[PDB]
Design brief:
InterPro entries: Beta-grasp_dom_sf (IPR012675), Mopterin_synth/thiamin_S_b (IPR016155), ThiS/MoaD-like (IPR003749). Keywords: Isopeptide bond, Nucleotide-binding, Phosphoprotein, Ubl conjugation, Ubl conjugation pathway. It holds the Pfam family ThiS. This is Small archaeal modifier protein 2. It is a single chain. The chain has a single domain, classed as Ubiquitin-like (UB roll) (Roll). A hairpin with a 2-residue loop joins strand 1 and strand 2. The chain is globular and about 40 Å long. The chain is largely without helices or strands. The chain has one helix and two strands, in the order H-E-E. It has a two-stranded antiparallel ribbon. Helix content is 9%, strand content 9%.
């Protein structure tokens, strides 16, 4: 299971396998970030740092201020 990281709505696609026993947090750990810089949302659904991802969830980290 590998992770992908993008800056809130920064446009960062990179397909990504997945694995067994791990968690959202870890994949975010592949960023060296249990997501600190952000709010996370997989498939358009919102989550917390511990609310897993699944499937090669990316990672979003950066001033997630959607309003521009």
């Amino acid at each position: 299971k590998m992770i992908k990281v993008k800056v809130i709505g920064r446009n960062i696609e990179k397909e990504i396998e997945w694995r067994e026993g791990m968690k959202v947090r870890d994949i975010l750990r592949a960023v060296g970030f249990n997501t600190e810089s952000a709010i996370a949302k997989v498939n358009g659904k919102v989550v917390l740092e511990d609310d897993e991802v699944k499937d090669g969830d990316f990672v979003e980290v950066i001033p997630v201020v959607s309003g521009g």
